[PDB]
């Protein structure tokens, strides 16, 4: 015996409408996430600029100290 669908009333072509309506909401949330993400990630470039200044000063320090040790060792 085939399944006889009972008596309903509606609906059509509306739930798809409301579901597709939130495309603007999705676009806004995605673009907001992208903007805030780039803004909160580019600061690592400045952090690595700090890393570069630290490596430059440590390299100068090590050059000076190794020259000092070469001076104080070769008797």
């Amino acid at each position: 015996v085939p399944p006889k669908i009972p008596d309903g009333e509606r609906v059509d072509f509306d739930d798809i409408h409301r579901k597709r309506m939130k495309d603007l909401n999705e676009l806004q949330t995605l673009i907001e996430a992208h903007f805030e993400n780039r803004k909160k990630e580019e600061e690592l470039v400045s952090l690595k600029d700090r890393i570069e200044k630290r490596r430059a000063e440590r390299a100068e320090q090590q050059r000076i100290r190794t020259e000092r040790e070469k001076e104080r060792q070769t008797r």
Binding site: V1, P3, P6, D7, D12, K19
Partner: protein, 371 residues
């Protein structure tokens, strides 16, 4: 309470609670036992990794899909997949939730009866209902007519519907689908030197197919162009380096859909089985079916298929009718979105197969009025 809209599929299991927009957990349906010996003690090595866990340890597993062509060939593995889906990907005990499975058209009865028997005895759900995978895809489009071509990964079927009245004599089910395209791509890649054999490397070939292949608008012109210039050769990096370059294998793999003679199948392509499915319908609803042709399923996501199919059907169909092909961007999950919509309806709330009904008539209840 809320209903569980599971959708077994063949290749990706998609599940989630009724009333949402997208499935909560989507993961390949593969169960892979380890094949080597194993020397580390106490590593906590399990005997079978299922779901998305076996797509990360696939280097030492032998993945095997439990669903071949719509039908289920290995019931223990399918039970394991369902148990994983319920308990670990959704974390909701099935004792308190109705379920809405999906099934391809024209499938063996025993498959459906065993499915309902498992759901009622092992997982012990309150009530489950089985629905045809094409009606849901028609729900999701918000239509009520139209002929839907649901080219999944297991089987491609083409169910025409008018005004809500399905036409059972016009369903054309063809067993060419994404898996055969993966095998054919893996077979034509050998013409350049790349050999993929292991069942784990089938996944790599599937990734190549997804990311690179596209459907040509005109086949002969593309074959001529790819044989003279080199503007098509796109490269791809394997999981270990050694990039590969795909030439005219790009549009030859998905061309099998429109010429199933490539893999030795006799039948006509998906461009001509739709026209045949239409012509079996009555003479007065052919215009509406022509104007509301719906695409669904994963395999219909190839870039440029909604134009090739329209060109082919326009060639076949009478010149006066307008041919329109609905290709929503959410094609892959169209069946599941439709399933959620159907499960969320109030009119549908009394069609579930309640457990007491199953206790009175046995598993053969599914073929009865509660379809």
């Amino acid at each position: 309470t809320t209903a569980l809209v599971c959708d077994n599929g063949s290749g990706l299991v998609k599940a989630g609670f009724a009333g949402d927009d997208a499935p909560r957990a989507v993961f390949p349906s593969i169960v892979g036992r380890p094949r080597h010996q194993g020397v580390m003690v106490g590593m906590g090595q399990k005997d079978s990794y299922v779901g998305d866990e076996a797509q990360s340890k696939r280097g030492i597993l032998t993945l095997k899909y439990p669903i071949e062509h719509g039908i289920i060939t290995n019931w223990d593995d399918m039970e394991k997949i369902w148990h994983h889906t319920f308990y670990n990907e959704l974390r909701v005990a099935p004792e308190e939730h109705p379920t809405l499975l999906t099934e391809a058209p024209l499938n063996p009865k025993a498959n459906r009866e065993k499915m309902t028997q498992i759901m009622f005895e092992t997982f012990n759900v309150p009530a489950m209902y089985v629905a045809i995978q094409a009606v849901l895809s028609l729900y999701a489009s918000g239509r009520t007519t139209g002929i839907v071509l649901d080219s999944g990964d297991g089987v491609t079927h083409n169910v025409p519907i008018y005004e809500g009245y399905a036409l059972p004599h016009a369903i054309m089910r063809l067993d060419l689908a994404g898996r055969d395209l993966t095998d054919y791509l893996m077979k034509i890649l050998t013409e350049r030197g790349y050999s993929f054999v292991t069942t784990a490397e089938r996944e790599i070939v599937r990734d190549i197919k997804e990311k690179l292949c596209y459907v040509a608008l005109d086949f002969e012109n593309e074959m001529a162009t790819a044989a003279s210039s080199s503007s098509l050769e796109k490269s791809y990096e394997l999981p270990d380096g050694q990039v590969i370059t795909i030439g005219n294998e790009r549009f030859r793999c998905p061309e099998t859909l429109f010429q199933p003679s490539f893999i030795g199948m006799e039948s006509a392509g998906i461009h001509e089985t739709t026209y045949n499915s239409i012509m079996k319908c009555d003479i007065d609803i052919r215009k509406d079916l022509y104007a509301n042709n719906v695409l669904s399923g994963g395999t219909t996501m190839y870039p440029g298929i909604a134009d090739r199919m329209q060109k082919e059907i326009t060639a076949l169909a009478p010149s006066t009718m307008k041919i329109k092909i609905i290709a929503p961007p959410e094609r892959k999950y169209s069946v599941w979105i439709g399933g959620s919509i159907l499960a969320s309806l109030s009119t549908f709330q009394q069609m579930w197969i309640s457990k007491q009904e199953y206790d009175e008539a046995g598993p053969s209840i599914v073929h009865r009025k509660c379809f």
